[PDB]
Protein backbone atom coordinates (compact mmCIF):
# COMPACT_ATOMS: atom_id res chain seq x y z
CA UNK A 1 0.00 0.00 0.00
CA UNK A 2 0.45 3.73 0.43
CA UNK A 3 3.49 6.04 0.11
CA UNK A 4 3.64 9.85 0.40
CA UNK A 5 5.96 12.77 -0.38
CA UNK A 6 5.29 15.94 1.62
CA UNK A 7 6.99 19.34 2.02
CA UNK A 8 6.38 21.46 5.17
CA UNK A 9 7.26 25.22 5.18
CA UNK A 10 7.32 27.60 8.17
CA UNK A 11 8.01 31.38 7.80
CA UNK A 12 8.08 33.53 11.02
CA UNK A 13 8.22 37.37 10.77
CA UNK A 14 10.89 39.15 12.88
CA UNK A 15 9.62 42.70 13.49
CA UNK A 16 12.65 43.57 15.71
CA UNK A 17 15.26 43.17 12.96
CA UNK A 18 15.75 41.36 9.66
CA UNK A 19 14.03 38.81 7.45
CA UNK A 20 11.57 36.06 8.41
CA UNK A 21 12.95 32.79 9.79
CA UNK A 22 12.23 30.16 7.07
CA UNK A 23 12.53 26.38 7.53
CA UNK A 24 11.57 23.82 4.86
CA UNK A 25 11.62 20.01 5.38
CA UNK A 26 10.79 17.23 2.89
CA UNK A 27 9.52 13.75 3.88
CA UNK A 28 8.88 10.45 2.21
CA UNK A 29 6.36 8.77 4.49
CA UNK A 30 7.84 9.22 8.01
CA UNK A 31 11.49 9.71 6.74
CA UNK A 32 12.81 13.29 6.55
CA UNK A 33 15.13 13.51 3.48
CA UNK A 34 15.89 17.25 2.92
CA UNK A 35 15.97 20.52 4.86
CA UNK A 36 16.50 24.25 4.27
CA UNK A 37 17.02 26.81 7.07
CA UNK A 38 17.41 30.56 6.20
CA UNK A 39 19.70 30.89 9.33
CA UNK A 40 22.10 28.01 8.35
CA UNK A 41 25.54 28.77 6.76
CA UNK A 42 25.11 26.61 3.59
CA UNK A 43 22.13 28.59 2.09
CA UNK A 44 21.57 25.24 0.27
CA UNK A 45 18.96 22.56 0.29
CA UNK A 46 20.74 19.92 2.46
CA UNK A 47 20.41 16.10 2.60
CA UNK A 48 18.92 14.54 5.81
CA UNK A 49 18.84 10.85 4.65
CA UNK A 50 21.88 9.07 3.14
CA UNK A 51 19.99 7.73 0.07
CA UNK A 52 19.23 11.30 -1.29
CA UNK A 53 23.01 12.07 -1.30
CA UNK A 54 23.32 10.04 -4.58
CA UNK A 55 21.44 12.89 -6.39
CA UNK A 56 24.02 14.87 -8.47
CA UNK A 57 24.86 18.62 -8.46
CA UNK A 58 22.05 19.55 -11.01
CA UNK A 59 19.48 18.15 -8.49
CA UNK A 60 20.89 20.14 -5.53
CA UNK A 61 21.25 23.39 -7.60
CA UNK A 62 17.57 23.09 -8.74
CA UNK A 63 16.21 22.30 -5.22
CA UNK A 64 18.30 25.17 -3.73
CA UNK A 65 16.97 27.64 -6.39
CA UNK A 66 13.34 26.53 -5.77
CA UNK A 67 13.59 26.50 -1.94
CA UNK A 68 15.17 30.04 -1.89
CA UNK A 69 12.31 31.23 -4.19
CA UNK A 70 9.80 29.54 -1.80
CA UNK A 71 11.38 31.52 1.12
CA UNK A 72 10.85 34.81 -0.82
CA UNK A 73 7.20 33.85 -1.69
CA UNK A 74 6.39 33.26 2.07
CA UNK A 75 8.18 36.52 3.04
CA UNK A 76 5.85 38.37 0.60
CA UNK A 77 2.84 36.34 1.90
CA UNK A 78 3.58 37.46 5.49
CA UNK A 79 3.29 41.12 4.30
CA UNK A 80 0.18 40.38 2.21
CA UNK A 81 -1.67 38.71 5.14
CA UNK A 82 -0.56 41.44 7.65
CA UNK A 83 -2.41 43.80 5.23
CA UNK A 84 -5.50 41.54 4.66
CA UNK A 85 -5.92 41.17 8.52
CA UNK A 86 -5.27 44.91 9.22
CA UNK A 87 -2.43 43.97 11.63
CA UNK A 88 0.38 46.30 12.86
CA UNK A 89 4.09 45.68 12.06
CA UNK A 90 4.80 45.22 15.82
CA UNK A 91 3.94 41.47 16.16
CA UNK A 92 5.52 38.22 14.88
CA UNK A 93 3.26 36.12 12.62
CA UNK A 94 3.58 32.68 11.05
CA UNK A 95 2.75 31.37 7.55
CA UNK A 96 2.80 27.58 7.13
CA UNK A 97 2.42 25.62 3.88
CA UNK A 98 2.29 21.88 3.17
CA UNK A 99 2.00 20.22 -0.24
CA UNK A 100 2.59 16.78 -1.71
CA UNK A 101 1.14 13.59 -3.13
CA UNK A 102 0.17 10.06 -2.10
CA UNK A 103 0.42 6.92 -4.24
CA UNK A 104 -1.79 3.91 -3.50
CA UNK A 105 -1.22 0.13 -3.27
CA UNK A 106 -1.29 0.10 -7.16
CA UNK A 107 1.66 2.64 -7.20
CA UNK A 108 -0.52 5.23 -9.02
CA UNK A 109 -1.57 8.71 -7.85
CA UNK A 110 -4.08 8.56 -4.94
CA UNK A 111 -4.28 12.09 -3.37
CA UNK A 112 -2.77 15.61 -3.71
CA UNK A 113 -2.48 18.42 -1.09
CA UNK A 114 -1.58 22.15 -1.16
CA UNK A 115 -2.72 24.06 1.94
CA UNK A 116 -1.78 26.95 4.22
CA UNK A 117 -2.22 28.26 7.75
CA UNK A 118 -1.75 31.77 9.19
CA UNK A 119 -0.97 32.07 12.93
CA UNK A 120 -1.75 28.33 13.26
CA UNK A 121 -5.31 28.43 11.79
CA UNK A 122 -6.50 27.08 8.38
CA UNK A 123 -6.18 29.83 5.71
CA UNK A 124 -6.70 28.15 2.28
CA UNK A 125 -6.60 24.49 1.12
CA UNK A 126 -6.89 22.75 -2.26
CA UNK A 127 -9.91 20.35 -2.00
CA UNK A 128 -9.42 16.61 -2.73
CA UNK A 129 -10.83 17.08 -6.28
CA UNK A 130 -7.78 19.41 -6.97
CA UNK A 131 -10.39 21.65 -8.73
CA UNK A 132 -11.56 24.13 -5.99
CA UNK A 133 -10.41 25.88 -2.76
CA UNK A 134 -11.57 25.93 0.87
CA UNK A 135 -11.11 29.56 2.10
CA UNK A 136 -11.60 29.76 5.90
CA UNK A 137 -12.42 33.55 6.00
CA UNK A 138 -12.71 36.71 3.85
CA UNK A 139 -8.91 37.21 3.70
CA UNK A 140 -8.46 33.66 2.25
CA UNK A 141 -11.52 34.41 -0.01
CA UNK A 142 -9.37 37.23 -1.54
CA UNK A 143 -6.58 34.70 -2.29
CA UNK A 144 -9.28 32.29 -3.58
CA UNK A 145 -10.68 34.81 -6.14
CA UNK A 146 -7.11 35.60 -7.34
CA UNK A 147 -6.21 31.88 -7.64
CA UNK A 148 -9.40 30.93 -9.48
CA UNK A 149 -8.83 33.70 -12.08
CA UNK A 150 -5.16 32.59 -12.57
CA UNK A 151 -6.08 28.79 -12.80
CA UNK A 152 -3.67 27.91 -9.96
CA UNK A 153 -5.51 24.60 -9.19
CA UNK A 154 -5.00 23.43 -12.83
CA UNK A 155 -1.27 24.32 -12.67
CA UNK A 156 -0.86 22.47 -9.29
CA UNK A 157 -2.78 19.34 -10.62
CA UNK A 158 0.01 18.84 -13.24
CA UNK A 159 2.67 18.84 -10.42
CA UNK A 160 0.58 16.79 -7.92
CA UNK A 161 -0.64 14.03 -10.35
CA UNK A 162 2.58 14.16 -12.48
CA UNK A 163 6.01 15.39 -11.33
CA UNK A 164 5.23 14.76 -7.61
CA UNK A 165 4.36 11.05 -8.24
CA UNK A 166 7.32 10.54 -10.66
CA UNK A 167 9.86 11.91 -8.08
CA UNK A 168 8.23 10.00 -5.17
CA UNK A 169 8.60 6.74 -7.14
CA UNK A 170 12.24 7.65 -7.97
CA UNK A 171 13.03 8.29 -4.23
CA UNK A 172 11.26 5.01 -3.16
CA UNK A 173 13.42 2.98 -5.61
CA UNK A 174 16.80 4.70 -4.69
CA UNK A 175 16.03 4.69 -0.87
CA UNK A 176 14.28 1.26 -1.21
CA UNK A 177 16.50 -0.59 1.39
CA UNK A 178 14.90 1.62 4.16
CA UNK A 179 11.84 3.36 2.59
CA UNK A 180 10.18 0.02 1.48
CA UNK A 181 11.24 -1.86 4.69
CA UNK A 182 8.60 -2.17 7.46
CA UNK A 183 10.02 -2.42 11.01
CA UNK A 184 7.49 -4.37 13.14
CA UNK A 185 7.22 -3.15 16.72
CA UNK A 186 9.35 -5.01 19.28
CA UNK A 187 6.71 -5.70 21.98
CA UNK A 188 6.84 -6.70 25.65
CA UNK A 189 4.81 -6.12 28.82
CA UNK A 190 6.01 -4.78 32.25
CA UNK A 191 4.25 -5.21 35.63
CA UNK A 192 4.37 -2.56 38.49
CA UNK A 193 2.60 -2.97 41.90
CA UNK A 194 0.51 0.23 42.70
CA UNK A 195 -0.85 -1.16 46.04
CA UNK A 196 -1.29 -4.55 47.72
CA UNK A 197 -4.63 -4.57 45.71
CA UNK A 198 -3.69 -3.48 42.17
CA UNK A 199 -0.96 -3.43 39.54
CA UNK A 200 -0.13 -1.62 36.29
CA UNK A 201 0.47 -3.69 33.13
CA UNK A 202 2.30 -1.62 30.50
CA UNK A 203 2.32 -2.80 26.87
CA UNK A 204 5.41 -1.50 25.00
CA UNK A 205 5.82 -1.08 21.20
CA UNK A 206 9.44 -0.12 20.34
CA UNK A 207 11.64 0.61 17.27
CA UNK A 208 8.78 0.44 14.71
CA UNK A 209 8.37 2.07 11.26
CA UNK A 210 6.30 3.64 9.94
CA UNK A 211 4.76 5.65 12.89
CA UNK A 212 1.11 4.51 12.35
CA UNK A 213 0.20 1.89 15.10
CA UNK A 214 -2.76 0.78 17.28
CA UNK A 215 -2.47 -0.63 20.86
CA UNK A 216 -5.71 -1.81 22.54
CA UNK A 217 -6.41 -3.49 25.90
CA UNK A 218 -9.02 -6.24 26.27
CA UNK A 219 -10.39 -7.85 29.44
CA UNK A 220 -11.77 -11.42 28.91
CA UNK A 221 -11.86 -10.67 25.12
CA UNK A 222 -13.77 -7.30 25.26
CA UNK A 223 -12.25 -3.84 24.51
CA UNK A 224 -11.44 -1.94 27.72
CA UNK A 225 -10.73 1.86 27.92
CA UNK A 226 -11.64 2.38 31.62
CA UNK A 227 -8.47 2.48 33.85
CA UNK A 228 -6.15 2.71 30.78
CA UNK A 229 -3.50 5.33 29.94
CA UNK A 230 -1.25 5.72 26.94
CA UNK A 231 1.33 8.05 25.41
CA UNK A 232 1.33 9.69 21.99
CA UNK A 233 3.65 8.07 19.46
CA UNK A 234 7.18 9.50 19.86
CA UNK A 235 10.41 9.33 17.82
CA UNK A 236 13.22 7.08 19.14
CA UNK A 237 15.72 9.46 17.38
CA UNK A 238 17.09 6.80 14.95
CA UNK A 239 14.19 7.04 12.50
CA UNK A 240 11.88 4.60 14.37
CA UNK A 241 8.98 5.21 16.77
CA UNK A 242 7.80 4.18 20.27
CA UNK A 243 4.46 3.93 22.09
CA UNK A 244 2.94 2.35 25.20
CA UNK A 245 -0.48 1.67 26.70
CA UNK A 246 -1.19 0.64 30.28
CA UNK A 247 -4.09 -0.75 32.30
CA UNK A 248 -4.57 -0.90 36.10
CA UNK A 249 -5.83 -4.33 37.19
CA UNK A 250 -6.67 -6.18 40.41
CA UNK A 251 -3.57 -8.07 41.67
CA UNK A 252 -3.83 -11.75 40.69
CA UNK A 253 -6.14 -11.00 37.65
CA UNK A 254 -3.36 -10.03 35.21
CA UNK A 255 -4.01 -13.10 32.98
CA UNK A 256 -7.55 -11.72 32.06
CA UNK A 257 -5.91 -8.81 30.18
CA UNK A 258 -4.53 -8.83 26.61
CA UNK A 259 -2.70 -6.06 24.74
CA UNK A 260 -3.44 -6.02 20.95
CA UNK A 261 -0.85 -4.49 18.52
CA UNK A 262 -1.70 -3.60 14.90
CA UNK A 263 1.04 -2.38 12.54
CA UNK A 264 1.82 -2.51 8.76
CA UNK A 265 4.95 -4.62 9.62
CA UNK A 266 2.83 -7.36 11.34
CA UNK A 267 1.20 -9.84 8.90
CA UNK A 268 -1.22 -10.66 11.77
CA UNK A 269 -1.92 -8.50 14.84
CA UNK A 270 0.04 -9.57 18.00
CA UNK A 271 -1.66 -10.43 21.32
CA UNK A 272 0.41 -10.11 24.52
CA UNK A 273 -0.63 -11.50 27.93
CA UNK A 274 1.06 -11.43 31.35
CA UNK A 275 1.86 -15.18 31.57
CA UNK A 276 5.65 -14.59 32.18
Amino acid sequence: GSHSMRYFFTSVSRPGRGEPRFIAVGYVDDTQFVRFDSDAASQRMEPRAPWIEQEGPEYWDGETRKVKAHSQTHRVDLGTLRGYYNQSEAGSHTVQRMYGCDVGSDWRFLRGYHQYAYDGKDYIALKEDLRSWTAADMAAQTTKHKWEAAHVAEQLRAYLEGTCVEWLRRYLENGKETLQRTDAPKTHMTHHAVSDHEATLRCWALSFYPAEITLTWQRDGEDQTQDTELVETRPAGDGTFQKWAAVVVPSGQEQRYTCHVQHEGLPKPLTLRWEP
Binding site: E63, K66, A69, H70, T80, Y123, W147, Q155, T163
Partner: peptide
Protein backbone atom coordinates in the same frame (compact mmCIF):
# COMPACT_ATOMS: atom_id res chain seq x y z
CA UNK B 1 11.38 17.52 -5.85
CA UNK B 2 9.88 20.97 -5.06
CA UNK B 3 7.08 22.41 -7.24
CA UNK B 4 8.63 24.93 -9.72
CA UNK B 5 5.91 27.65 -10.20
CA UNK B 6 5.11 30.79 -8.18
CA UNK B 7 1.80 31.20 -6.29
CA UNK B 8 1.37 34.27 -4.01
CA UNK B 9 -1.43 34.63 -1.39
Amino acid sequence: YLQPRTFLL
